[PDB]
Design a protein around this nucleic acid. Structure first.
Lengths: 243, 164, 129, 406, 44, 23
RNA sequence: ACAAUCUUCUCACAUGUUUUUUUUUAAAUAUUUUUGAGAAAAUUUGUUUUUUUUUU
């Protein structure tokens, strides 16, 4: 109702889920990975002037990143204090390793070493204080190969604050802002329920029209949802796009 | 006379560029001076006297018996041999022992530079066994350069009778 | 006489056309140098091709700059076979580099025919559906 | 009685059927030819009667060796030595073990000191009884042979008759245990569903570590050829935040039984144990059984196996697949991608090198694994020469293979 | 493989002992007023 | 004659100065 | 001079909130969708800071 005075959700999400399930067609390694739901939004104008190396945290009722995924936290020096805080807060099961900014820049400088570090963790969380420096010392090995640090806020230095920031980061999706009139975001997975996927899509659309799209719903031209290889049915189209 | 291949190999030394890079890494791992060691020890003594956990030191390895021992134990990553040891028999076996153990090695020019690194007047041989995690790439690059400029180069004159 | 094409490999970041030409001219005149660069972005493909005035000088630079440890990279200097030397070997060589600001060009670029195309695309989408 | 207290300390109150029909006759100095299955409780059957014998005669180190026990393989001998330590915890009679592949120069000094209860193997025992000067054995009054059918299966034909010609026969009590009665056993007595993974050697531990991480929420048991390998593997895994129980314990039988009982009661968890230790124990309903190392006795292994079974096989040991075809056993091949395999080899090597006890355990486990590998019955299938020692040390956390005397 | 099969001593995994002997000797001299402390040297 | 190390160091310095000026 | 300046941000606003942190080898090599309309969101994949005709 916010985009074009209509809410063509739920039914579109249910139809897409049914189509994905219908289109289904020894090994020793197995994982709970599922095909994500890709929501692509089209604007009539360039949303981004230039590429931004800072992920945008879009809150979603249904978490996208699994809570069992390994997370690596980058904190300001010294790293002993942050590591002790994580151990005290009980987040060691999620934040497997804490690496300082100086240690990350020095101890891992080779491209092969940077690639090995990136492939050893499923989620990379960076403190907001050292987020700008993460653009360097990481390079195209991480910031282009599906590893954009999440700007966690742990500047307070409290165990409860760190746990809250970790919970918020794990329970929210990350969207990269880049120069284009088009964006694509991860709204959910195949295992996610139709109602949960619709709620996540609505939250993503509301966030896009609020803090992403300068013109809000007026600047949004078309919105569609699809899978990794499935087609995108028209979820919402602007009735006054010509005007 | 005709120089045997074991002695003739000491006439071909590491070139200017690679030797310069070698001593640049080495100078980051110089042993603690007698003065610096004394200050660190009295600092711990004052802590002990008033009221009272460290890390393993990192430095270059020197001494002929020590370095030959490290090579035999395969603990050495790079062995640099002085090219002008006055009785040459002290190091004439070193390139072959470094070949048997598969230790990267080079013959650097003169022993005064090697001794200066270790705060002595003279060092016949230096060895690098451990580096900090930030110097792993620098040591690996030098090992490749030493191989390409000293081992990949030559390797045919060191089997030939030089001199004459 | 024979115009020796000495290639340089494992070029450290920064050892670009100006720096190479200046350094390699010291050994011998560098007629033409075209450091390889990406078509889109012009990022140095990290290898270049120096056409030394004489094959002798190119050979001399080969032996003195091969396996050369420059900033952690063993410069691979091998004189490019003059028989393998091509004509597009130095096409557009030594040019001030022109990676168009495509990102801005497409961005500044941003009617009825477009609306008709959108309607046709919508009809095609409906046909696909 | 000190023997009774040690038995209580070991954690044993009731006796087995083999012990019931052998302990009484043994206490009367009667030679017995026994036929008991593997893991039937024989360990207390032949050890405690000769310990009482040693106490009764008041043997001293100066008298030399009075009891000799012959074991087929090193791992079985080491377990028997471990049991004898538990039984002799309150006695002043010396004991020791000599085995092939061990420090012979050290064992000669041990034998000269005077070891009463000796646990050995035919190969090493014959060597020491011939060439070791100062080894006193003229007072031998009890000889025991275990797994005679297995012993003759190893290839100790020419040694068993050779060793008996040296050892004294008069007044000596004799014991012979053999599960299967072939024609050779009486000849010596008269004179006296599968799953396999083709994994490279250097990637063996990394695949196991990745697999155990994937199956953390299940019940997994792993069989490994040596107890020293078990101790190092458990200690290493506990050091990388992977809590895994082990049946090695502190070589205390009570702790091993307690650990096994806790593992069976627990719905989830991973336990490491050897094939020999697991031999004779009721395997619970475990989701995964893993054969990290090739079994010492494939004939026993195929009968023992008959939720999911996995076997780590090196590419050079693919001939064992042909053996499984000749045994008429169904099997399947499991494939793994190198991208899911954890690349913590560099971290593993750093951790081992930094810590003393971790490095000491790794060297012992590497040495024991190689010695167990070199003594396998299937020489054509598991050839130590075909094995690459550089890769084996890589799986143990070494940059270079440690120097072990084969 | 390494040439020597000798076991690794514990001295290579622990803080140096002869340095500790010197530290205790230096601490004794400070207690006995034989060696001027770093603060005393700095203030003088 | 001067070594190629000075050439690359000068370029990186110029790029470093260009970057700071853009700051 | 083989060293030089790639960000251990913030910004306001009212602790919250908000606004920021231009920065990312070389290639090879990838997603069907959005769409963007080469360009553009865009799985990406592998990978020596690797690297020879092929200048952006």
């Amino acid at each position: 109702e916010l985009l074009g005075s209509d809410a063509p959700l739920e039914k579109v999400c249910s139809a897409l889920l049914e189509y994905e399930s219908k289109r289904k067609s020894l090994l020793e390694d197995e994982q709970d990975d599922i095909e994500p739901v890709w929501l692509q939004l089209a604007t009539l104008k360039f949303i981004g002037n230039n590429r931004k190396l800072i992920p945008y945290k879009i809150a979603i009722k249904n978490p996208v990143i699994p809570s069992s995924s390994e997370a690596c936290l980058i904190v300001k020096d010294p790293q002993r204090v942050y590591k002790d805080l994580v151990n005290e807060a009980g987040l060691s099961k999620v934040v497997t390793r804490v690496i300082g900014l100086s240690k990350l820049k020095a101890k891992w400088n080779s491209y092969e070493q940077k690639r090995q570090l990136r492939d050893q963790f499923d989620i990379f969380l960076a403190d907001d204080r050292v987020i700008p420096m993460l653009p360097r010392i990481l390079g195209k090995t991480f910031y282009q190969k599906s590893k954009v640090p999440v700007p966690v806020k742990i500047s307070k230095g409290t165990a409860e604050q760190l746990k809250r920031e970790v919970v918020s980061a794990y329970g929210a999706t990350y969207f990269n802002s880049a120069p284009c009139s088009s964006f694509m975001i991860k709204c959910g997975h195949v295992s996610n329920t139709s109602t949960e996927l619709a709620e996540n899509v609505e939250s993503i659309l509301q966030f896009v029209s609020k803090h992403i799209v300068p013109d809000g719903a007026k600047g949004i031209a078309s919105i569609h949802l699809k899978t990794s290889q499935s087609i995108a049915i028209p979820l919402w189209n602007n009735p006054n796009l010509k005007e | 006379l005709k120089v045997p291949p074991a002695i003739a190999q000491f006439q071909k030394t590491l070139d200017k560029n690679t030797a310069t890079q070698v001593f640049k890494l080495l100078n980051k791992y110089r042993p603690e001076t007698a003065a610096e060691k004394k200050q660190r020890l009295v600092a711990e003594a004052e802590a002990v006297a008033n009221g009272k956990v460290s890390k393993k030191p990192y430095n270059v390895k020197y001494g002929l018996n020590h370095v030959v021992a490290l090579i035999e134990a395969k603990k050495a990553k790079l062995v640099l041999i002085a090219s002008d040891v006055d009785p040459i028999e002290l190091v004439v076996f070193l390139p072959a022992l470094c070949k048997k153990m598969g230790v990267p090695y080079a013959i650097v020019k003169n022993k005064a530079r090697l001794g200066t690194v270790i705060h002595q007047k003279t060092a016949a041989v230096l060895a690098v066994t451990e580096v900090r995690e930030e110097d792993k790439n620098e040591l690996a690059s030098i090992v490749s350069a030493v191989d390409a400029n000293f081992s990949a180069k030559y390797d045919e004159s060191r089997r030939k009778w030089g001199g004459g | 006489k024979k115009k020796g094409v000495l290639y340089v490999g494992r070029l450290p970041h920064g050892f670009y056309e100006k720096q190479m030409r200046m350094y390699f001219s010291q050994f011998g005149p560098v007629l033409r140098l075209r450091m390889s660069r990406n078509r889109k972005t012009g990022s140095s493909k990290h290898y270049a091709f120096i056409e030394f005035e004489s094959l002798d000088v190119a050979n001399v630079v080969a032996e003195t700059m091969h396996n050369y440890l420059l900033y952690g990279k063993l410069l691979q200097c091998k004189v490019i076979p003059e028989d393998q030397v091509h004509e597009n070997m130095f096409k557009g060589a030594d040019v001030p580099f022109k990676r168009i600001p495509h990102a801005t060009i497409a961005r500044l670029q941003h009617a009825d025919k477009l609306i008709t195309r959108h309607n046709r695309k919508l009809k095609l989408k409906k046909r696909k559906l | 009685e000190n023997i009774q207290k040690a038995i209580k300390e070991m954690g044993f109150e009731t006796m087995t059927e083999i012990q019931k029909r052998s302990i009484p006759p043994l206490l009367a100095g009667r030679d017995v030819l026994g036929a008991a299955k593997t893991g039937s409780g024989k360990t207390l059957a032949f050890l405690i009667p000769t310990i009482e014998m040693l106490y009764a005669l008041k043997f001293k180190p100066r008298n030399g060796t009075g009891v000799i026990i012959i074991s087929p393989t090193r791992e079985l001998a080491l377990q028997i030595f471990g049991v004898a330590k538990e039984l002799l915890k309150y006695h002043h009679q010396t004991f020791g073990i000599v085995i092939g592949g061990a420090n012979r120069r050290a064992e000669a000094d041990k034998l000269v000191k005077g070891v009463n209860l000796l646990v050995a193997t035919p190969g090493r025992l014959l060597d020491h009884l011939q060439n070791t000067k100062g080894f006193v054995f003229r007072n031998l009054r009890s000889l025991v042979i275990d797994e005679a059918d297995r012993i003759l299966e190893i290839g100790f034909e020419d040694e068993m008759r050779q060793i008996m010609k040296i050892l004294p026969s008069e007044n000596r009590q004799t014991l012979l245990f053999s599960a299967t009665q072939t024609t050779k056993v009486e000849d010596l007595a008269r004179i006296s569903e599968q799953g396999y993974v083709v994994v490279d050697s250097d990637k063996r531990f990394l695949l196991l570590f990745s697999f155990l991480k994937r199956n953390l929420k299940k019940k997994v048991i792993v069989f490994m050829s040596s107890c020293a390998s078990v101790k190092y593997m458990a200690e290493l895994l506990n050091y990388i935040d992977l809590p895994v129980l082990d049946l090695h314990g502190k070589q205390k039988q009570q702790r091993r039984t307690n650990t096994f009982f806790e593992f069976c009661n627990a719905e989830k968890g991973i336990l490491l144990c050897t094939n020999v230790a697991a031999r004779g124990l009721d395997i619970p309903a475990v989701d995964w059984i893993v054969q990290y190392d090739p079994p010492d006795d494939p004939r026993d292994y195929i009968h023992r196996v008959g939720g999911k079974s996995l076997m780590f096989l090196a590419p050079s040991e693919l001939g064992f697949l042909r053996y499984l075809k000749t045994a008429k056993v169904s099997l399947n091949e499991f494939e793994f991608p190198a991208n899911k395999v954890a690349n913590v080899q560099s971290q593993l090597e750093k951790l081992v090198s930094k810590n003393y006890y971790l490095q000491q355990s790794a060297k012992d486990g590497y040495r024991s694994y190689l010695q167990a590998y070199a003594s396998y019955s299937l020489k054509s299938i598991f050839d130590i020469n075909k094995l690459d020692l550089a890769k084996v040390a890589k799986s143990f956390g070494f940059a270079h293979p440690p120097n072990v005397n084969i | 493989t390494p040439l020597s099969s000798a076991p690794e001593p514990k001295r290579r995994f622990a803080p140096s002992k002869h340095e500790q002997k010197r530290i205790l000797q230096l601490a004794y001299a400070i207690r006995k007023g034989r060696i001027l402390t770093s603060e005393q040297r700095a203030e003088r | 004659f001067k070594r190629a190390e000075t050439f690359i160091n000068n370029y990186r310095q110029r790029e470093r100065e260009r970057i700071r000026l853009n700051r």
